């Protein structure tokens, strides 16, 4: 069970990870070109957790100079119950305040019932009820 | 009236007008420090339009690899109607293009009817009904 950060070289391993995980709608930016300038620019701030040379979860993130932004956290269905989501969780937050990132931000889909009562029982977050979100179409 | 590059030692200046206009809460984060390191993470990405020396209109943004995020956008009061916000829009969308960036998010609290009526009139824009945002205590 190794924790450690996502490097260049993990694209096609992070990648099937995505394609099998079903609530994940992959897109251009999943690609290689748009990961690679990912990772340089957020360098040791996305974590994988491997066992046997096989990765079986994942946090990307990264930030802008003012806030974090947290994208596909996945742990693999043989891996649940092994508290994975909140080790990658908690070591992404103190790699993020190294570099001044006091708050972060995730999105997750209305439809994402999973996802929406893992954020719920986070403690350490609250969902948002004062703010919209417009985005470009 | 010029449109131009925000660049650090604009930091008084932009300050100065952030605290005289009422939709901004001050924060952390607009301390010169974080500013400083926000402008050499986005370079070029945070604009203001000066007129006679003095600064009166501004968009600070920026983005972590994958989304663009805008923060700050103020015109001031005696310069409204001139199309100055959609300027620096356009032009702010246009820089982030060439990065790569091809999403940007912008958030916008349910008090501010100023700034939502603003954003439900940009065509280029949608209100995200299909999220929730949960962000760090």
């Known amino acids: 069970m190794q924790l450690r950060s ?3 070289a993990d694209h096609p391993a992070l990648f099937a990870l995505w394609s099998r995980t079903p609530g994940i ?18 360098p040791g701030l996305s974590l994988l957790v491997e066992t046997e040379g096989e990765v079986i979860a994942c946090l990307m993130a990264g930030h802008d100079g003012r806030r974090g932004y ?7 269905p043989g891996y649940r119950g092994l508290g994975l ?3 990658m969780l908690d070591e992404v937050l103190a790699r993020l305040a190294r570099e001044g990132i006091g708050k972060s931000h ?16 986070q403690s350490d ?4 009820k004062d703010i919209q979100v417009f985005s470009t179409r």
Do not use: G, M, S, T
Request: glycine share 0%.
């Open 6 to 8: 996502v490097i260049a």
């Open 125 to 128: 977050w609250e969902r948002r």
């Open 85 to 87: 989501a909140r080790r």
């Open 106 to 121: 995730v999105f997750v889909l209305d439809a994402a019932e999973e996802a929406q009562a893992f954020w719920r029982a």
């Open 70 to 76: 947290l994208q596909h956290l996945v742990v693999d």
């Open 25 to 42: 709608r992959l897109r251009a930016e999943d690609a290689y070109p748009f990961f690679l300038a990912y990772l340089q620019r957020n």
